[PDB]
Amino acid sequence: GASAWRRVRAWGPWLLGLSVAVRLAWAYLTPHGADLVDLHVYVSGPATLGHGNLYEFTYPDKTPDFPLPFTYPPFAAVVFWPLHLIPFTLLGLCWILGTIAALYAVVRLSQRLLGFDDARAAAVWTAVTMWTEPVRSTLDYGQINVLLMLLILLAVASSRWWISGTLIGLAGGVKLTPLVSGLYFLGARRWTTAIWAGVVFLLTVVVGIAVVGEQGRYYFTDLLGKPDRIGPIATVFNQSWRGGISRILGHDAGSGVLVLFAYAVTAILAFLAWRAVNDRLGQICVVEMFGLLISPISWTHHWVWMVPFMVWLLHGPWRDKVGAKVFGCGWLVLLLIGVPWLLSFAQPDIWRIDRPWPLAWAGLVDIVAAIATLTWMAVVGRR
């Protein structure tokens, strides 16, 4: 029914408005709705700046069970030192509004990348995907994942080498996970932009050493970005290969042979999927789908890159293939409902790795969905 599709498109602004009102009401009416454990970490990290206790910092106020640390790169603390100058509520409401606006802007950028501009459809997409498990997880925790997605797609949209390079470098300096997006630029043969993005990431490392130095150092040696310190590896929310393999195993294999084989097979699948795509949005979406699978820690709130992927599926060049619609609706039903969020209740505690067949196998849900999408893209491209 394309008529109903047009009717709902016309009802965009007054559906995104409803979604934003509902989200804002929930956050500031329910206890722990505006808890913002990761925004409070970002605010209390730099708040201790200049006192030699920034990475030894722990934040158990909001989750006594698990003390939230400041695992971000020191450049993130440099960037968040201004947040120390803003009252907590004036920053919480600002951050929620910023994440919402970043979601709308990234949807608009995805539409522009696909070759069409549609403010109403962008509002509808923002409202519908606002409640996808990754987006609601980011909003709940205050984690900056929509903002970095916006920065990365802004870099992709801008053909100018310096703009894209600087955006990618700064965004990757704030968090190391989005650095995998740079690989897309390697695939796009944008060698100069990739070089500049790497240079900016190194200059962000230098800034972090300068400002947050003498307290946060050796961030790559003796630490290796160890997944354990960031958080539990086996918890179902950790939807990377490592999380699901640990669930089905009962013990974190980590760099084990069996995890390495999975890493290699997903590497080949993602490379074939990218080889099966030709448009910027699809290429970046495949690259980030692979990044979410290879990173040692990829919580649900990291999987906000799926939203541009669904936009590509339902509007990109493959808006007619039977498989394209099938997998777009599959991703929508999976994320909107959220299997990992539902399964997280079954496990005794976030630190329990042993699982029976149901709670372990169902823990491979998002991994299996991503691998199925990658294999489908590879086979359809090869054919």
Numbering used by the authors: 21 to 403
What does the paper say about this structure?
PimE, the focus of our studies, is a polyprenyl-monophospho-β-d-mannose (PPM)-dependent mannosyltransferase that catalyzes the transfer of the fifth mannose from a PPM donor to the Ac1PIM4 acceptor substrate, leading to the formation of Ac1PIM5 via an α(1 → 2) glycosidic bond. PimE contains twelve TM helices with both the N- and C-termini located on the cytoplasmic side of the membrane. PimE, like many other structurally characterized GT-C enzymes, is an inverting glycosyltransferase, which is thought to operate through a single-step nucleophilic substitution mechanism facilitated by an enzymatic general base catalyst and can occur in either a metal-dependent or independent way.
In this study, we used single-particle cryo-electron microscopy (cryo-EM) to determine high-resolution structures of PimE in the apo form and in a complex bound with its mannosylated product Ac1PIM5 and by-product PP at 3.0 and 3.5 Å resolution, respectively. The phosphate group of PP is located along the cationic half of the cavity. At the same time, the mannose head of Ac1PIM5 is positioned along the anionic half. Only the first three prenyl units of the polyprenyl chain of PP could be resolved, with the chain pointing towards the hydrophobic groove between TM helices 6 and 9. Our structure reveals a network of interactions between PimE and its ligands. At the center of the binding pocket, D58, located at the tip of JM1, forms a hydrogen bond with the C2 hydroxyl group of the fifth mannose of Ac1PIM5. Y62 forms a hydrogen bond with D58, potentially stabilizing its orientation within the active site. The phosphate group of PP is coordinated by three conserved residues, H322, W319, and K195. K195 forms a salt bridge with the phosphate, while H322 forms a hydrogen bond with one of the phosphate oxygens.
